[PDB]
């Protein structure tokens, strides 16, 4: 159980110990270097004006290994303060992470960090595990990518996984844009931080979009005041729900792709007719970008308008879904029956990195 659990996210890394109920360390996935030695996380972000920030994980997939190693080293020694060679380590990966990518993670872990053992789990599958279920369809929306992953008794159907290259940062960028069209001005790194805060506190998904627009144009019953750090007080109106509406309508940011209600529906339709009922009735939502109030209700409505009239639709969106993935790892890594699922250093020293599968 004394294993480590590290959820390598596009925007945030969630690290802790198997068994805890929440990540002990949550820092931005960033590696910066002096503009003209090496910093990670918050600090590297703070000293931005004199460094070169780099994101090792763009859309869920680790793209730059040298930087990733820095994140892992920082995760172990600075954030958790432990010896990686003394703790089995469980790492997470995106839904369709390439085999070669996984093997490279496994190699670095054993050879560079000397972990006694490790495991790589599909993020979405852990979110499902967190709710104590092994079958259902997960909608995972984080910082840089959104996925729909159908799962049957622990098996993720690769051919039914749906993706949408739109998540949290795009929503933040988009809220900045429409807030600026309203008269305010949000364009700098700093103002971005203010908009992300506005996004996470005042935004919500409208059950019925067009009607909500009408209500915002008809009255001020939807307005909300927000105090800037300097005291200025602005009002957020229809941008409260217009921002999140982008998830169901990617066209708001010029993306001609299906919204999350359709990605969920498409994903289910890729599965055999006899198991779709168990996807519809176990639609789990996870990730920071599924935190919007009213999103579960909006999804339940959309899917109901798409599924057969006799189909039971149930959305599972817990209050702590922001860390569902990490939590599913903490639980799975603590199970006594999972201890034989680890990959030992002895085993690794056999078929090399091509052992993690």
């Amino acid at each position: 159980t004394t294993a480590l659990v590290c959820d390598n996210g596009s925007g945030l890394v969630k690290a802790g110990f198997a068994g805890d109920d929440a990540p002990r360390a949550v820092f931005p996935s960033i590696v910066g270097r002096p503009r003209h030695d090496s910093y990670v996380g918050d600090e590297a972000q703070s000293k931005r004006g004199i460094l070169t920030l780099k994101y090792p994980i763009e859309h869920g997939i680790i793209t730059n290994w040298d930087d990733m190693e820095k994140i892992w080293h920082h995760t172990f020694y600075n954030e958790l303060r432990v010896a990686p060679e003394e703790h089995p380590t469980l790492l997470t990966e995106a839904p369709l992470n390439p085999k070669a990518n996984r093997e490279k993670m496994t190699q670095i872990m054993f050879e560079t960090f000397n972990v006694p053992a490790m495991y790589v789990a599909i993020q979405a599958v852990l979110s499902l595990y967190a709710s104590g279920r092994t079958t259902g369809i997960v909608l995972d929306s984080g910082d840089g990518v959104t996925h729909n992953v159908p799962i049957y008794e622990g098996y993720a159907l690769p051919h039914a996984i749906m993706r949408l290259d739109l998540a949290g940062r795009d929503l933040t960028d988009y809220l900045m844009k429409i807030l600026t069209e309203r008269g305010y001005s949000f364009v700098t790194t700093a103002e971005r931080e203010i908009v992300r805060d506005i996004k996470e506190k005042l935004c919500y998904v409208a059950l019925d979009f067009e009607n909500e627009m009408a209500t915002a144009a008809s009255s001020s019953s939807l307005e909300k005041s927000y105090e800037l750090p300097d005291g200025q007080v602005i009002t957020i109106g229809n941008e409260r729900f217009r921002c999140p509406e982008t998830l169901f309508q990617p066209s708001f940011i010029g993306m001609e792709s299906a919204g999350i209600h359709e990605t969920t529906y498409n994903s289910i339709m890729k599965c055999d007719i006899d198991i779709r009922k168990d996807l519809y009735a176990n639609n789990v939502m996870s990730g920071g970008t599924t935190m919007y109030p009213g999103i579960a209700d909006r999804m339940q409505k959309e899917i109901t308008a798409l599924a057969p009239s006799t189909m039971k639709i149930k959305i599972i969106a817990p209050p702590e879904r922001k860390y569902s993935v990490w939590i599913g790892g903490s639980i799975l890594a603590s199970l006594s029956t999972f201890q034989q699922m680890w990959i030992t250093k002895q085993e690794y020293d056999e078929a090399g990195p091509s052992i993690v599968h």
């Binding site: 709710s131 299906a258 176990n282 199970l335 029956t337």
Partner: protein, 442 residues
């Protein structure tokens, strides 16, 4: 040697004594539920109540030697009352004048059972444990009745042992993850055996064989007949043997062993199969290979429909070759290849294959083209994208159709495709819809 005149009696009494009244009642609830898939919860609970009564009485020490055979007949008598409180097999009436001992019930291709959330499960278990357990054994067994009885009893038993154990745990959610993972093996074995057995029951051994060869050919198009034919034949044999066998080991043993052969022979022929075979246990592999979609077909020159003089290896070869190069779902191929080989066969003498050959070749060619149109675009696009293109298709072919009408045809066609254009589409249902769809083909 023939089973004793009282093979049944001695069997039930032996079970009633080894399990006690409670567990024998459960065994019976499961048994009569799978036997009567359409039976309401009360018709089956009522019958089960009668069965357990007779059994207790007729198995009692000093019981009249005619008792069991007398009561069971008074049980069948009640099953003919019209206003009977017991279930009834299709046309059980055309027998009420002993066919009511072993009548057939078709497989369930669209199970409705939906496991409730953990919260709902525990909410109903608290209210009434016995009730919950009974309602569950009924609905599950009526929905997955084609799985062997021993598998159903074993699964429903372990599942209930999980609910009682996790709903009273300090960490329900944590317990459910642990218990559900340990239950995975049996759960997979149970639900998957029901599905493969329902297909087998619908097809019959001959069609089933053909069906499994077609499906294996579509999953591994770049394989050799010798690589798959033995496998397709292996599963068919396991199906005819284990689907209806009291041997509480047949399926449980055979199925995992089939998966090992599947991997030994196919592991190194496809990226997808390699992935499937890397799974931890047999059932994890079987679920992967079972769900594996028809692959992108190689696309080679047309294949010739054998019509010479000719064991049975030429038609197998042809099936294999045709399916591996024809983008048409297995339910279509199985549907047309059956009455196509029935014609070629009833031909053999040589003059025959000369007047029918061209006849069968054309209809088959026409059939294949019809299906490709009914299933066009379905496999290559997400469903919502398929519906768009479909509307684009039907529009430019029905200029006078009103937007409303157009959308009605779109819905009907896409509805058909979502049910009959994938690798594991339901045989019974699709065989009837395919006929209907072809007539409306346009």
């Amino acid at each position: 040697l023939e089973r004793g005149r009282d093979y049944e009696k001695n069997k039930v009494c032996k079970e009633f004594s080894h399990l006690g009244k409670e567990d024998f009642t459960s065994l019976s609830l499961v048994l009569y539920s799978r036997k009567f898939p359409s039976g309401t919860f009360e018709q089956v609970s009522q019958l089960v109540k009668e069965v357990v009564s007779l059994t207790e009485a007729c198995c009692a020490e000093g019981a009249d030697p005619d008792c069991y055979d007398t009561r069971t007949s008074a049980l069948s008598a009640k099953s003919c009352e019209s206003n009977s409180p017991f279930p009834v097999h299709p046309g059980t009436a055309e027998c009420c004048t002993l066919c009511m001992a072993a009548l057939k019930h078709q497989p369930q291709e669209f199970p409705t059972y939906v496991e409730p959330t953990n919260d709902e499960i525990c909410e109903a278990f608290r209210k009434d444990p016995k009730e919950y357990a009974n309602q569950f054994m009924w609905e599950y067994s009526t929905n997955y009745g084609q799985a062997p009885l021993s598998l159903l009893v074993s699964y429903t038993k372990s599942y209930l042992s999980m609910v009682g154990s996790c709903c009273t745990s300090a960490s329900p959610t944590v317990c459910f993850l642990k218990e559900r993972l340990q239950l995975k093996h049996l759960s997979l074995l149970t639900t998957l055996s029901n599905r493969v057995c329902s297909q087998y029951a619908a097809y019959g051994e001959k069609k089933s064989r053909l069906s499994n060869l077609i499906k294996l050919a579509q999953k591994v198009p770049t394989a050799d007949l010798e690589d798959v034919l033995p496998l397709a034949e292996d599963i068919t044999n396991i199906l005819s043997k284990c689907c209806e066998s009291a041997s509480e080991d047949c399926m449980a043993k055979e199925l995992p062993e089939h998966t090992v052969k599947l991997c030994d022979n196919l592991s190194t022929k496809n990226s997808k199969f390699e992935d499937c075979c890397q799974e931890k246990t047999a059932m994890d592999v079987f679920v992967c290979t079972y769900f594996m979609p028809a692959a992108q077909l190689p696309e080679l020159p047309d294949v010739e429909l054998p019509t010479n003089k000719d064991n049975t290896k030429v038609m197998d070869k042809y099936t294999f070759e045709l399916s591996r190069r024809t983008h048409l779902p297995e339910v279509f191929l199985s549907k047309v290849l059956e009455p196509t080989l029935k014609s070629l066969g009833e031909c053999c003498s040589t003059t025959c294959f000369n007047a029918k050959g061209p006849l069968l070749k054309k209809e088959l060619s026409s059939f294949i083209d019809k299906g490709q149109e009914l299933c066009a675009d379905y496999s290559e696009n997400t469903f919502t994208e398929y519906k768009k293109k479909l509307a684009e298709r039907l529009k430019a072919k029905l200029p006078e159709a009103t937007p409303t009408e157009l959308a009605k045809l779109v819905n009907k066609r896409s509805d058909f495709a979502s049910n009959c254009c994938s690798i594991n589409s339901p045989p019974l249902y699709c065989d009837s819809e395919i006929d209907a769809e072809l007539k409306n083909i346009l």
